[PDB]
Write a protein that binds this ligand. Sequence first.
Ligand SMILES: [Ca+2]
Length: 159
Amino acid sequence: EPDANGYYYHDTFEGSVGQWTAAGPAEVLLSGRTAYKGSESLLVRNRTAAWNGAQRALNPRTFVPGNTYCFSVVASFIEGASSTTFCMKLQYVDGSGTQRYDTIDMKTVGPNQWVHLYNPQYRIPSDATDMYVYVETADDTINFYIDEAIGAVAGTVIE
Ligand SMILES: [Ca+2]
């Protein structure tokens, strides 16, 4: 079911936001201000809390709970702080019907520099439903950009 390169989803943000939406009162939109690949990335703005960010639903048919998968996205920011800590996380619902977050990867970086959020061997909890991959920063509300968001078979190598 994955593509040639073992990718289940691959969002370049070149003309489309894919299944990506905003979390919180924020807004996500295509932007040509900066890009990692191509001419555009996804801009995340109007954040008022750190927990605000960008998210994308995961199909339970494709991403089977209890199994391992590779997730990757590149992120950067331009202004608002001297540094930040990006978090890519799994937002999901557990066996008790309560929403939880599980960290997939996190990276600290300065302004104007792409950083690679990456985990080729992330295990999705077995009791997980209503899953979303979720990107945010740890402790601020700056605008930020993401590009090349990928979800792939476990062990997939992304440089
Ligand atoms: Ca792009």
